[PDB]
Structure 1
Amino acid sequence: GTCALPSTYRWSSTGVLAQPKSGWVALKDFTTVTHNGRHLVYGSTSSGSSYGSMVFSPFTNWSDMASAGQNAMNQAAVAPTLFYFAPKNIWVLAYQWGSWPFIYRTSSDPTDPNGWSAPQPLFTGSISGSDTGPIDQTLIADGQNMYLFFAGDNGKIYRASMPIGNFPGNFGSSYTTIMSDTKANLFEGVQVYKVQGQNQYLMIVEAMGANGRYFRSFTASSLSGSWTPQAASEGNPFAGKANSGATWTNDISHGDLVRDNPDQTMTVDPCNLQFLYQGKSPNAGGDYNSLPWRPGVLTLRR
């Protein structure tokens, strides 16, 4: 009863799923798990002038995201990663921009935007040839090791690791440069997942295409292994204008595959693949930080 990842992806898409509440011009950079039978979604916010973060009130159906309460975090967790860390029975929210390059907080109740612990260092390193520094972290563990993957708006993807018994904790300053390409080809928004029922991991990376933002996919048999391009061009992307089925956006940008199991393995079911992404009206212009990003969901057509 197991499925494999397709070689060519075809999606159908929702329309815009929610509008930002008063004071925000964008909802961005989503991370999502199922918690108590409901969708739990964190994201970045932008007022145009500054970035923050928020969590939606839990909702059962994506069609009800539009009415879900939008709960601001009193301390910004930009480009967040949410998961349940089973070995310690604790939830983890990792993010960027704060006292360290990457940061995390912990909680026993991930629905509360302000129930998170004092911030702790996740990563303290620096990268060369990057205007942004380390950005868009994700975290993923197998049975043995916890991995940190991140980008740099510079064509590189980076990786750090620790024995899983040492997490939650600080990866420190060290990293491995695992991928190197043009800036456009490996830009940001890196995510990594375990493919359920297969000895395979899936990496997606946001790229800058001629037509807009899209995702390129890569596979590996191990988290410390080499990554093989899968659906890795604008014409044959993991998800993009070419195959999204979205009518409201030419961009498929920073989000998260829908994770039914909320745990640190980041496991996805290839039989039921869905992608919570950010998109925007093709007519929207102005400064990047003011762009009206919105949530959408892609569902894989099999």
Structure 2
Amino acid sequence: SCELPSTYRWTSTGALAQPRSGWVSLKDFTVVPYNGQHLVYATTHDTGTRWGSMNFEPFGDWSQMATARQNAMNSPTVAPTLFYFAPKDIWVLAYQWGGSAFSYRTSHDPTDPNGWSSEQVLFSGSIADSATGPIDQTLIGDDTHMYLFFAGDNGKIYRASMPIGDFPGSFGSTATVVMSDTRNNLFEAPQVYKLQGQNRYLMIVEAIGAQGQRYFRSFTATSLDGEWTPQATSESNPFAGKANSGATWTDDISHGELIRTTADQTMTVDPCNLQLLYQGRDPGSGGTYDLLPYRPGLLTLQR
């Protein structure tokens, strides 16, 4: 494969879709390959105070995201993570702000926004020193374990694990801090992937920059239960940010996901073809955080 660069350079699209009437934003994207198409779920917010979730109809190419039907979910699954859990031939949708810290549901047809099972507990722990509590889960498995990573809007990244044979189920109520920094440097939206062709995992984490602009920092590990090493960890030399995105429609490069080689729990990405589906917003936007007009965009790594 292709080693991660020490300096990332991207090109970007503009906004790839506008929210369906009634929503002010589309956020926190999760995306899988599904029958040769892209299947995307997202957080929504309306014009008042309501968070929700949605999926898009599957679409073939990124120009079709703008016209793909946007399907409200009748059960809100904010900041979702979608994947196929191969060992039990079942799809899993993990999320937050349900009945415990994190939740999940299952389905045999992930294109159906309303086909998910009743809510199941994914994590029932609490964390110290956090205004939000646990936020922005992500999940990944290797040959023997499933792993849960999450943030706390507090400078820490947390990890829990279970034997893969016990999944789907709850990770319990305890977690291990695997990294800590200032609140702004390890803020939220972690995503963890296996790099195809390398004995290496990639973690990206959203950070808040010096003028409030959102960007991503990257870290690597050789084992999911091992230590993380800074890979691109400043605003001027980020994994992805205003410094290197090639995007003018947005300064923020915020909560999203890399395009994967598989839908399943191995969370594999091709380091020769990194692409980031992120949320961005017009630099002229402002006002209360919850009403910010986020939209999807796509970065393609230059090589």
Shift of 1:247: 1.2
Shift of 1:146: 0.3
Q: Trace 1:133-148 onto structure 2 (pairs within 5 A).
A: 133-148=133-148
Distance across 2 between alignment mates of 1:158 and 1:126: 11
Letter in structure 2 aligned against 1:260: T
**Partner SS, residue 63 of structure 2:** helix
Query: Which residue in 2 is equivalent to 1:235?
Result: 236
Query: Which residue in 1 is equivalent to 2:44?
Result: 45
- Would you say 1:114 and 2:114 are equivalent positions? yes
Letter in structure 2 aligned against 1:241: K
Query: Which residue in 1 is equivalent to 2:79?
Result: 79
Distance across 2 between alignment mates of 1:8 and 1:40: 30
Give a deviation string over 1:259-292, Cα, whole Å, max 9, x none. Answer: 1310101000011110000000010011000000
- Would you say 1:201 and 2:201 are equivalent positions? yes
Distance across 2 between alignment mates of 1:54 and 1:142: 29
- Would you say 1:218 and 2:219 are equivalent positions? yes
- Would you say 1:177 and 2:142 are equivalent positions? no
**Partner SS, residue 150 of structure 1:** strand
Distance across 1 between alignment mates of 2:264 and 2:274: 17
Give a deviation string over 1:222-271, Cα, whole Å, max 9, x none. Answer: 00110000011000000000000011000000000011310101000011
Structure 1 unaligned segments of length 5 or more: list them.
none
Letter in structure 2 aligned against 1:52: G
Letter in structure 2 aligned against 1:32: V
Give a deviation string over 1:11-62, Cα, whole Å, max 9, x none. Answer: 0000100000011000000000110000000000001411000000000000
**Partner SS, residue 126 of structure 1:** coil
Query: Which residue in 1 is equivalent to 2:4?
Result: 5
Distance across 1 between alignment mates of 2:298 and 2:66: 13
Letter in structure 2 aligned against 1:123: F
Letter in structure 2 aligned against 1:23: G
Structure 2 unaligned segments of length 5 or more: list them.
none
Letter in structure 2 aligned against 1:253: S
- Would you say 1:192 and 2:192 are equivalent positions? yes
**Partner SS, residue 130 of structure 2:** coil
Query: Which residue in 2 is equivalent to 1:279?
Result: 280
| Identical positions, percent | 73
Query: Which residue in 2 is equivalent to 1:17?
Result: 16
Distance across 2 between alignment mates of 1:64 and 1:112: 19
**Partner SS, residue 87 of structure 2:** helix
- Would you say 1:262 and 2:260 are equivalent positions? no
Give a deviation string over 1:105-136, Cα, whole Å, max 9, x none. Answer: 00000000001011100000000110000000
Letter in structure 2 aligned against 1:250: D
Deviates more, 1:148-157 or 1:203-212: 203-212
**Partner SS, residue 121 of structure 1:** strand
TM-score (norm 1): 0.99
**Partner SS, residue 182 of structure 2:** coil
Query: Which residue in 2 is equivalent to 1:299?
Result: 300
Shift of 1:5: 1.4
Structure 1 segments, 4+ long, off by >6 Å, are none
Q: Trace 1:19-38 onto structure 2 (pairs within 5 A).
A: 19-38=18-37
Query: Which residue in 2 is equivalent to 1:63?
Result: 63
TM-score (norm 2): 0.99
**Partner SS, residue 66 of structure 1:** coil
Distance across 1 between alignment mates of 2:260 and 2:55: 16
Say what the alpha-carbon RMSD is for the aligned residues: 0.6
Give a deviation string over 1:164-203, Cα, whole Å, max 9, x none. Answer: 0000000110100111100000000000000000000000
Distance across 2 between alignment mates of 1:301 and 1:54: 31
Distance across 2 between alignment mates of 1:265 and 1:9: 24
